[PDB]
Symmetry: C4
Subunit: 219 residues, 4 copies
């Protein structure tokens, strides 16, 4: 009798059972940071991990039985699938980072609690309207990063030797973080006019962000 399992997943106790579970693995993962805790009580913490990872895998499968193909247009579930799946690749071999990846699963507190999903809606939703302004700027970064690599990358490789470096550096300058005493004044000992580059650049990059914040605000 299909509808019988299908009704369990939708219950208020199931989700909250899961919500109460994630909060537990999350607090677990916190204590997992304490080096003292991890070998004074480490086995319980390894155990909770396999249980919860199994239980969550069960929970996702049930919702798959229930939702069938309509599960794969729920971003939240797609997220849940990929985030639980992540926590399931075997540690042995491969990437130790995937082992760190597991904690992303703590974002399920977001996935399972309606206000957070609703908070994100305010967050995600101004983004599509910005992609155009994000397009102009990105282009600018791409153009200026290039000019910065050719003008300063020979003598200042750490900062500008490569395209990526001009980007990472320019972002920094864009965040305005220790940009003068830290990047331009040194440049200017070798290339006295480097300010004719950065000062306009900062302007454009500063100006755009400001007006971008404005168009967001009126709405």
């Amino acid at each position: 009798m299909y509808l019988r399992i299908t009704n369990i997943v939708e219950s208020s106790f199931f989700t909250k059972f899961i919500i109460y579970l994630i909060v537990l693995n999350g607090i677990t993962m916190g204590l997992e940071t304490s080096k003292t805790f991890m070998q004074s009580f480490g086995v319980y913490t390894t155990l909770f991990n396999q249980i919860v990872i199994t239980i969550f895998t069960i929970e996702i499968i049930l919702r798959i039985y229930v939702h069938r193909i309509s599960f794969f247009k729920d971003p939240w579930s797609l997220f849940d699938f990929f985030v639980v799946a992540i926590s399931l690749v075997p540690t042995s071999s491969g990437f130790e980072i995937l082992r760190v990846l597991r904690v992303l699963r703590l974002f399920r507190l977001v996935t399972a609690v309606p206000q957070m999903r609703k908070i994100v809606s305010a967050l995600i939703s101004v983004i599509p309207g910005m992609l155009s302004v994000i397009a102009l700027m990105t282009l600018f970064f791409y153009i200026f990063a290039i000019m910065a690599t050719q003008l300063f990358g020979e003598r200042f490789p750490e900062w500008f030797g490569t395209l990526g470096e001009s980007f990472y550096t320019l972002f920094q300058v864009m965040t305005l973080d220790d940009w003068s005493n830290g990047i331009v004044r040194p440049l200017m000992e070798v290339y006295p006019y480097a300010w004719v580059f950065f000062i306009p650049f900062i302007f454009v990059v500063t100006f755009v962000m400001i007006n971008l914040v404005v168009a967001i605000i009126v709405d």
Copy 2:
């Protein structure tokens, strides 16, 4: 004597006298900071402090007789109690710290001047809307602080050794405080891809902030 006391506390001179005294204690507390000045007046001051702390103690008692239970449903009045109270623990016995905490009674000039109560009130009133966006931020901070301890706490313990440290650093980075030349460039000498953590983090953190302001303005 109920009405007789009631007419005292409510007079325009008692509060003005008490307010005047606050302005007086505040002038002395500033004065107390000079170690020269202390030698000449140290005792001289020491008593004005104990006089003012008593006069105020009288005040709190008088105001309580009039209101009984209605005194302790006034958030502004509770604060006055708690602020004068902790100034009652003796100059030792627990921590020389309480001795520094007592300066909080100058927040009484706020307490006693109505124009200020509205500004503070206007200020406090923005907060409840934020508590949803605030909570969400705390989760992201909690998740990333964990990944950060595991990723960077071994080679860079000052910055990421513990959740606390991972937190503190992240807050700093959140403030974009010397974040670039000062933290992420050093991380990258060891973990070249560390920019994949902070650059996305900085994005989320500055973005959510915008909308925290956006939602404030619009609402």
Copy 3:
């Protein structure tokens, strides 16, 4: 005698004469910056400044014969008065800083050109709305300067050694300037809990400002 002079001061020639003299002086003052120029043309422009100072003085006297009381209840005319008067104080010997206040006379470009006054006035108009907030800030900064000088002033005399210094260092923290790697991290080497003064202070100091601006928008 009245109108003929009166027919002078409201005339487009008079003000414009005074305007072109500001701009010329604004240009002459740039030249005075180079030791090189001053070396071989210094006596040339030391005199030009003098004519203009006289001309501005004649100008202030005239507007007074014409206006009298009306003159000294006009803020833009009062500034001019004061910004001309200060420029009347002797350069070479005795007091040296007033010699530097002279270039303040380039602010006469603001008073004499109508689009500037309106923008300055629009700008000033914002101020009354925020004075309650501003008073609050100074009480708040003060309260904190006291706690700071006594908490940290001993091991970090430079940063908190004096009431005035703690105001200063705290003001820096509000600009978020090099605040963490630069101040709090160091403070924490000795006083691990110093983040309990500065992280809340930061949140609050950030909070109020944001609201002051939001207050401007709403106003």
Copy 4:
């Protein structure tokens, strides 16, 4: 007959064709940034460029036939002209700052795509309303830059030795970047009241900026 060419220029293939060319050269110019790529494909890109600068040149000529005297009244076309003109001067052997200036041609992506031109058009559009404020700021900066040179250039020539420098530092202090520990605290070692120049300065420049944004928002 002149009519026959005119129908080619105006086609939907044409403008789309040029855009597509821009994106190739834009991808291609990222490739000129890698010396590695240059030891294999450099010969392809040194000429792929040259025919693009040829094709764009042919195209600019064409658009001049079709639009006549009205072409040099089109802001976007005028740019195309100059940004293409720059790209034609061969290789080295003059001022080779110009070889990198070639990349400004990737901004034709902006001129030729209508959403980008709007944002940009929208963005520039805020400028005319700022020009009164920019004028004021620059008069403020220029004034404070003069003063800094007379007060601080002797002992701190790197920073205030000359007007330009004084300008630069003041710009830096305005972006609030490592201003205290980086500039003013060192100043104060020799000239103790420098905080009185810089903190009011810091306020004003901060005051205007906040207030201009509010003006953007309401209008």
